[PDB]
């Protein structure tokens, strides 16, 4: 058997929360469960080990506990400064190995859209000296995220291999995304407007910029 | 405790990566070290532990003869040998600190994980390093940048002005083409005055191939 | 409607310099200009096609280009491997023929 655990968790800063993480007979009870937490960019860093002791290094802010089939981690409180994905770890007899839980985000809990913002960067001369045309349009200064970019030619959608980039977070509070487009120059030449949309979950900009100049 | 080790460098599928960290501040004839991958989406996997003391190193039921593990007692550095790395490999590579003792299949639920430090990363690879290709990009407030592409492996460094403008500069994230190839996206912002008159050139250093390629933008004619 | 191209070019190693390659009305503008070369007994190669694309195993020094009646060939540096004598070469409709100039000779100075 596989530990499997909550992809994902909602938590208002100020009060605790726990994660629970469903065993069978064999892996929770019976062996001990460890928790693994990563930061983002860095080196993970055990948690608890053992269910009853803490290791030196954290202030007595977290616990951890077993329960039957489920093992608890209860977080009191959350700071938004810190999220950090929590792993679950035990032991089996019959795989005779480590096995390991999928990872669970944590968020804290609203604030209202923005207007974003999308250009087209048709390629120059030199791109299409080399017998290829590629296409990218990029989106910034929205917030939040989840934004699919399809393209469209102003008559009929074309799906030669589209592709969308997953939404990254920058410094200065806001997401951005961009989309790729690689074709050739015999179809490049064929229409002479391209542009690409973004959904905003309510916004939609078409940004329309001839291939001229 | 420390980790400090250097970055694997991209192998082909069907071949050998190396990944060893450096063991200091105590003796390496107790501590059994465990070799995991951090697999992006999903949980961790294990294969083995490593005795420094005795031959008495096992395998998993799922790794049989991926893995081969050789010991080493006067760098006192565990050495790795993999062989037919897949798709499955792309996941960085650290090395888990362990402490104490076990031999036998009944004292493995005492332990925990003790030290992660500077992992390195491994993953199976098509595309490997080649020599960019890169031409200037057209621009459309105003917006311009350049593209990169024909380039492995991630990441590059594009830098504007000889780097002496930073605000605005985002490295956009690349996507997984079926080519094997990437696309690292760099814009900045300009007002609508200045499109065609002030030259802006932006700079990509491309580490394993040692080129350094200056392109001049300009509009399409 | 016959080409007309210089017999000899002058050109200095270590900037760049161009050529220009006219010819008649109706020859020019309607039809594009193909630059090619050949090597003094060996077969002829292609050095430029259409004016906008660089062919693959030619090292990217001639610049393809045509501005008008008259045709610009424009190059970026010299160098003494480089020696090989360039034509210049056109379809003409009322022709029904590739038209061929004197070709160029090209010596360092």
């Known amino acids: 058997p596989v530990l499997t655990q909550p992809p994902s968790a909602s938590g208002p800063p100020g009060q605790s929360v726990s994660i629970s993480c469903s065993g069978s007979?064999?892996?929770?009870?019976?062996?001990?469960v460890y928790w693994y937490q990563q930061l983002p960019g860095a080196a993970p860093k055990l948690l608890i080990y053992k269910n009853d002791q803490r290791p030196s290094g954290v202030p007595e802010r977290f616990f951890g506990s077993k329960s039957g089939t489920s093992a608890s981690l209860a977080i009191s409180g959350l700071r938004s400064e810190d999220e950090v994905d929590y792993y679950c770890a035990a032991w089996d007899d019959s795989l005779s190995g480590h096995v390991f839980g999928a990872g669970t985000k944590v968020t804290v809990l609203g604030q209202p859209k923005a207007a974003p913002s999308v250009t087209l960067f048709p390629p120059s001369s030199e791109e299409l000296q080399a017998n290829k045309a590629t296409l990218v349009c990029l989106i910034s200064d929205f917030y939040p995220g989840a934004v699919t970019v399809a393209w469209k030619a102003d008559s009929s959608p074309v799906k030669a291999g589209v592709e969308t980039t997953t939404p990254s977070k920058q410094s200065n509070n806001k997401y951005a995304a961009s989309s790729y487009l690689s074709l050739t120059p015999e179809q490049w030449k064929s229409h002479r407007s391209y542009s690409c949309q973004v959904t905003h979950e309510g916004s939609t900009v078409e940004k329309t910029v001839a291939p001229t100049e | 405790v420390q980790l400090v080790q250097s970055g694997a460098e991209v192998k082909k599928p069907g071949a050998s990566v190396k990944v060893s960290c450096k063991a200091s501040?105590?003796?390496?004839?107790?501590?059994?070290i465990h070799w995991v991958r951090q697999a992006p989406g999903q949980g961790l996997e294990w294969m083995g532990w490593i005795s420094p003391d005795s031959d008495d190193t096992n395998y998993a039921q799922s790794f049989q003869g991926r893995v081969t593990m050789t010991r080493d007692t006067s760098i006192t550095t565990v050495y790795m040998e993999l062989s037919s790395l897949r798709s499955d490999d792309t996941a960085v590579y650290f090395c888990?600190?362990?402490?104490?003792?076990?031999?036998?299949?009944?004292?493995?639920?005492?332990?925990?994980?003790?030290?992660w430090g500077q992992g390195a990363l491994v993953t199976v690879s098509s595309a490997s390093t080649k020599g960019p290709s890169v031409f200037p990009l057209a621009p459309s407030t105003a917006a311009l940048g350049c593209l990169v592409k024909d380039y492995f492996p991630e990441p590059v460094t594009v830098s504007w002005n000889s780097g002496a403008l930073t605000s605005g500069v985002h490295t956009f994230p690349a996507v997984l083409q079926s080519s094997g190839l990437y696309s690292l996206s760099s814009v900045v912002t300009v007002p609508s005055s200045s499109l065609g008159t002030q030259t802006y050139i932006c700079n990509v250093n491309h580490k394993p191939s040692n080129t350094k390629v200056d392109k001049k933008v300009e509009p399409k004619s | 409607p016959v080409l007309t191209q210089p017999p000899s070019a002058s050109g200095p190693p270590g900037q760049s310099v161009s050529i220009s390659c006219?010819?008649?009305?109706?020859?020019?503008?309607?039809?594009?200009?193909?630059?090619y070369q050949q090597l003094p007994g060996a077969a002829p190669k292609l050095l430029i096609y259409k004016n906008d694309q660089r062919p693959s195993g030619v090292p990217e020094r001639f610049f393809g280009s045509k501005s008008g009646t008259s045709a610009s060939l424009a190059i970026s540096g010299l160098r003494s491997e480089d020696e090989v004598d360039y034509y210049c070469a056109a379809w003409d409709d009322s022709l029904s023929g590739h038209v061929f100039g004197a070709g160029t000779k090209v010596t360092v100075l």
């Open positions: 888990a600190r362990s402490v104490g003792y076990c031999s036998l299949n009944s004292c493995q639920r005492w332990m925990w994980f003790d030290t």
């Open positions: 007979r064999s892996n929770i009870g019976t062996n001990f």
């Open positions: 501040g105590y003796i390496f004839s107790d501590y059994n």
